[PDB]
């Protein structure tokens, strides 16, 4: 029963516990800006 003459169904592959992830996100400046809290869609100053 040479592997070259039988179906893949008999050979279950190993499952690695890794996950390639190439995505990145650039640093944010949000901490510099001034923080304001509101409770309505419109405001005045």
């Amino acid at each position: 029963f040479e592997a070259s003459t039988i179906g893949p169904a008999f050979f279950t592959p190993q499952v690695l516990a890794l996950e390639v992830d190439c995505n990145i996100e650039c640093a944010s400046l949000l901490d510099l800006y001034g923080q304001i809290e509101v409770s309505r869609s419109t405001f005045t100053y």
């Binding site: 592959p13 996950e19 390639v20 190439c22 995505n23 996100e25 640093a27």
Partner: protein, 260 residues
Amino acid sequence: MKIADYGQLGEYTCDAKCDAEFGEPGNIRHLEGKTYDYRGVFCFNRKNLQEANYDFLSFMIGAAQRSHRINRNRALMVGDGINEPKGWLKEDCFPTFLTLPVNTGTPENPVQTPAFLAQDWRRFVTSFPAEYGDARSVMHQNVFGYLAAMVDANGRFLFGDGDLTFSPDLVRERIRISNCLPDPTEGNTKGGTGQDAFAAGSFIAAQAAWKTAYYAVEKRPMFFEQYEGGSSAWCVKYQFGAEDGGFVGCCEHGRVLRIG
């Protein structure tokens, strides 16, 4: 697995709309790899092997392992995926950077000569994207020596000045030296002006975050055994082999520098 993309779900919408738009979801992929086989054989004559006053058997048993280590280390670097692990200098997936030439002639009849200057090293090293984390360089010791033996216009040394020799802390500097890689100086004979100048396209150094740019898989260690089917009453045969493999990971985590 591998997360090719994350998609773009949300959007900024007008308050007059009661409905919302369906976004494009992400993408995921399944990938798999193999493991390759290393095999060899050598033969002896019984009479000579018995009567010789040197242990050729152990000599060959040592040479085989030495060759296995050398070949594995070289195959992970410049191998091709047919039967060997595919190397990162062969796949040519890492982005490449070229070093500009230096003019050595007059302003009206210039002579362009390929060159490698000190500031190019700093430019290359400091350009690694910060998000990818820490990285390390790889070089042939002759490149490091050529870099350390530089002088300025007045004849004084750059880097270590006032000292006979310069020897920085390599681990702190984040540089690793190994003579396996190609050598651009050609044994310290090239690197000047005229006929001694570099050759365009020569490899110099590479940088990457290795723990995520290349992987190595271990399956079996080397084994030896006698081949009874070929052994005879007058001459003998042996067989050995081992298994291993490797594959590239994130192609964006690498950088290669070359002479332009």
